[PDB]
Design an enzyme around this catalytic site. Structure first.
Site, PDB file in Angstrom:
ATOM      1  N   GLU A   1     -54.450 124.056 105.148  1.00 13.50           N
ATOM      2  CA  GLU A   1     -54.649 122.807 104.364  1.00 13.50           C
ATOM      3  C   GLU A   1     -53.731 121.685 104.840  1.00 13.50           C
ATOM      4  OE1 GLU A   1     -54.305 120.102 101.762  1.00 13.50           O
ATOM      5  OE2 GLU A   1     -55.885 120.207 103.339  1.00 13.50           O
TER       6      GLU A   1
ATOM      7  N   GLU B   1     -54.386 125.549  99.938  1.00 13.84           N
ATOM      8  CA  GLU B   1     -55.839 125.395  99.882  1.00 13.84           C
ATOM      9  C   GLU B   1     -56.426 125.050  98.505  1.00 13.84           C
ATOM     10  OE1 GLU B   1     -56.408 126.401 103.377  1.00 13.84           O
ATOM     11  OE2 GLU B   1     -57.596 124.572 103.033  1.00 13.84           O
TER      12      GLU B   1
ATOM     13  N   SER C   1     -64.649 123.133 101.132  1.00 13.81           N
ATOM     14  CA  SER C   1     -64.080 122.805 102.422  1.00 13.81           C
ATOM     15  C   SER C   1     -64.975 121.725 103.098  1.00 13.81           C
ATOM     16  CB  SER C   1     -64.078 124.051 103.322  1.00 13.81           C
ATOM     17  OG  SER C   1     -63.436 123.725 104.551  1.00 13.81           O
ATOM     18  N   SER C   2     -64.472 121.136 104.176  1.00 18.04           N
ATOM     19  CA  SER C   2     -65.213 120.151 104.958  1.00 18.04           C
ATOM     20  C   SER C   2     -65.338 120.690 106.385  1.00 18.04           C
ATOM     21  CB  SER C   2     -64.475 118.815 104.982  1.00 18.04           C
ATOM     22  OG  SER C   2     -64.559 118.195 103.716  1.00 18.04           O
TER      23      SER C   2
ATOM     24  N   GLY D   1     -59.285 117.674 110.211  1.00 16.51           N
ATOM     25  CA  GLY D   1     -59.349 116.314 109.667  1.00 16.51           C
ATOM     26  C   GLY D   1     -59.746 116.097 108.210  1.00 16.51           C
TER      27      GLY D   1
ATOM     28  N   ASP E   1     -57.718 121.657  97.316  1.00 15.41           N
ATOM     29  CA  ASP E   1     -58.996 121.127  97.789  1.00 15.41           C
ATOM     30  C   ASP E   1     -60.002 121.193  96.622  1.00 15.41           C
ATOM     31  OD1 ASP E   1     -58.184 120.474 100.305  1.00 15.41           O
ATOM     32  OD2 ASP E   1     -59.389 121.990 101.398  1.00 15.41           O
TER      33      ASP E   1
ATOM     34  N   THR F   1     -55.027 122.147 110.068  1.00 17.97           N
ATOM     35  CA  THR F   1     -56.381 122.630 110.455  1.00 17.97           C
ATOM     36  C   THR F   1     -56.467 122.516 111.940  1.00 17.97           C
ATOM     37  OG1 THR F   1     -57.306 121.720 108.408  1.00 17.97           O
ATOM     38  CG2 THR F   1     -58.874 122.301 110.180  1.00 17.97           C
TER      39      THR F   1
HETATM   40  N1  LIG Z   1     -58.356 121.773 103.751  1.00 17.47           N
HETATM   41  C1  LIG Z   1     -59.385 121.003 104.495  1.00 17.47           C
HETATM   42  C2  LIG Z   1     -58.894 120.756 105.926  1.00 17.47           C
HETATM   43  C3  LIG Z   1     -57.619 119.936 106.036  1.00 17.47           C
HETATM   44  C4  LIG Z   1     -57.552 119.209 107.376  1.00 17.47           C
HETATM   45  O1  LIG Z   1     -58.435 119.458 108.235  1.00 17.47           O
HETATM   46  O2  LIG Z   1     -56.624 118.397 107.574  1.00 17.47           O
HETATM   47  C5  LIG Z   1     -60.779 121.670 104.546  1.00 17.47           C
HETATM   48  O3  LIG Z   1     -60.894 122.914 104.385  1.00 17.47           O
HETATM   49  O4  LIG Z   1     -61.750 120.908 104.781  1.00 17.47           O
END
Ligand SMILES: N[C@@H](CCC(=O)O)C(=O)O
Lengths: 182, 359
Positions: free
Chosen positions: A21, A40, A62-63, A83, A43, A1
């Protein structure tokens, strides 16, 4: 990311978080085409039944939190970071430090962050006082024996008074901020 | 030399890689706008920070349009293929497939949306063609660039999964991981980019590339088909807004959990006014920790793709709900059993899903 941001002479502003991801995603490359494929879908929840269960054509939770802050309807700050679940915490912390504590943007970005999503998952960066960690663990928290870097916040501030821009890249990666002049 | 803080009168770029920052800044210097620059940057990062993002994934791109004054999000989050199923990550006994192992399976590949989102962005706000913007990255891929310590580390750290796919021909030259200093060349990727430059995104979502990717996902166990790629379209999301200290925050709505919980944590923390405490005081950390515990519990119970599930967004941010949560926080003790609250009490409707603990 990875998170990056851009602001131009005309007022446009971009805050963009993008990812595959895990690092290198699945590790799978389209043979003959060099494209590394995302992982992905992990998640999604592995055990179904909940809000984030896997479903055909559904998108995994997602975050990623690309964000733009406005003052009197003009964009004045952009924030984002990589992150995983810690993204929310890195963005929250940068905003807190720059806005509530009033710290200069770079210093807000570099202020040691913490992250903890449950009683068994804690992370902290180098700089969180050791005496503080001992007081918090003393109360029931579970911070570990060693620090880890958290996030990588790229951020742009826009001063509409002086008509200037300020860019910052988190020292957690080797990023770069480049201002434009003319 | 490159700086981590800079100022400018006419624009600004901040990215995690100097070569990508240089490419995006070059676009602005030559008269293009922030969206043009951002698209250029995405291709550059795809090449130079390959383990972090690219046309093989997806993202959320928020854009404030200086002409219309509106803010929108180009949501390029990947979609599970039509053949995916709720328990595809469970073993024959109903237990989840170990994560590190789950990550390498074909079933884990989402239908890529990044390229489609860049296309959409240029279409709406672009002033430079995808042809002009992708070309500098075709050069970095084709003629290479030197890899630093970081990329060298990622390569060695992930050698095992890389060593199992065609990826090993690019990152594990003979059988060895490229080291810091070595030139990383990505000839196939340059070919793909050149196809996108002349053909457009159709080069990716249809045709031969589509078939090879679909076929490869199948070869590694997933169910992705050419029709899944043909069906993909990004989504245009409206930002979730929140008032905060006199500022207005435009952040990401579901399918991301980010925006709702950034706003919820800020509202929860307001009751404790952090700045009355020194920035490195145990008090400040104690409060951030207890607040994160509540918000991440709510995230785990109520966040999902809104096209499929009812996310109680109004409830999770309702002032009386926020007050309920702030009530659970005490400076002098730790809540050892933090739990999600009930936002549904503060809005209409109910969840159309259950609460299921995850391993
Ligand atoms: N797959 C995560 C992000 C992974 C990362 O930031 O290390 C997301 O969409 O929140």
């Amino acid at each position: 990311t990875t998170h990056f941001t851009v602001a131009d002479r005309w007022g446009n502003v971009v805050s963009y978080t993008t990812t595959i991801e895990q690092l290198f995603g699945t590790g799978i490359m389209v043979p003959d085409y060099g494209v590394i494929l995302n992982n992905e879908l992990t998640d999604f929840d592995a055990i179904p039944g909940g809000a984030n269960e896997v479903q055909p054509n559904k998108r995994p939770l997602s975050s990623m939190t690309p964000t733009i802050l406005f003052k009197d309807d003009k964009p004045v700050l952009t924030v984002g970071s990589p992150g995983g679940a810690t993204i929310i915490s890195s963005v929250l912390q940068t905003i807190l430090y720059h806005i509530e504590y009033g710290m200069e943007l770079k210093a807000a970005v570099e202020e040691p962050r913490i992250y903890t999503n449950s009683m068994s998952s804690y992370r902290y960066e180098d700089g969180v006082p050791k005496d503080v960690l001992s007081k918090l663990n003393g109360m029931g928290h579970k911070f570990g024996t060693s620090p880890v870097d958290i996030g990588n916040v790229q951020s742009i501030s826009i001063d509409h008074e002086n008509g200037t821009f300020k860019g910052v890249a988190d020292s957690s990666r080797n990023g770069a901020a480049i201002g434009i002049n003319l | 030399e490159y700086k981590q803080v800079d100022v400018g009168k006419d624009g600004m770029v901040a990215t995690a890689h100097p070569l990508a920052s240089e490419i995006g800044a070059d676009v602005l210097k030559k008269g293009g706008n922030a969206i043009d620059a951002a698209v250029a940057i995405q291709f550059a990062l795809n090449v130079t920070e390959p383990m972090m993002s690219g046309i093989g994934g997806g993202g959320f791109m928020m854009v404030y349009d200086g002409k219309t004054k509106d803010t929108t999000i180009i949501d390029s989050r990947e979609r599970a293929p039509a053949g995916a199923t709720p328990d595809m990550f469970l073993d024959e006994n109903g237990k989840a497939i170990p994560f590190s192992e789950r990550v390498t399976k074909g079933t884990a590949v989402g239908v890529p949306g990044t390229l489609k989102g860049l296309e959409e962005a240029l279409d709406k706000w672009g002033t430079r063609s995808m042809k002009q913007l992708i070309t500098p990255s075709i050069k970095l891929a084709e003629k290479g660039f030197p890899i630093d310590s970081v990329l060298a580390e990622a390569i060695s750290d992930y050698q095992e999964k890389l060593s199992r796919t065609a990826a090993k021909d690019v990152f594990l030259p003979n059988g060895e991981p490229l080291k810091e200093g070595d030139t990383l060349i990505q000839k196939d990727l340059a070919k793909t980019f050149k196809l996108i430059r002349s053909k457009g995104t159709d080069a990716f979502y249809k045709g031969k590339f589509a078939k090879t990717l679909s076929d490869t996902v199948q070869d590694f166990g997933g169910s992705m088909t050419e029709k899944d790629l043909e069906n993909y379209d990004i989504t245009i999301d409206e930002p979730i807004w929140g008032d905060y200290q006199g500022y207005q925050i435009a952040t990401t709505p579901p399918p991301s959990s980010g925006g709702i919980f950034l706003l919820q944590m800020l509202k929860i923390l307001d009751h404790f006014n952090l700045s009355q405490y020194d920035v490195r005081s145990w008090e400040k950390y104690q409060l951030l920790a207890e607040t994160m515990h509540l918000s991440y519990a709510d995230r785990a119970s109520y966040a999902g793709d809104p096209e499929f599930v009812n996310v109680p967004l109004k409830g999770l941010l309702h002032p009386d709900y926020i007050k309920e949560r702030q009530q659970l926080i005490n400076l002098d003790q730790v809540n050892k059993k933090p739990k999600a609250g009930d936002p549904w009490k503060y809005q209409e409707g109910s969840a159309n899903y259950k609460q299921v603990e995850q391993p």
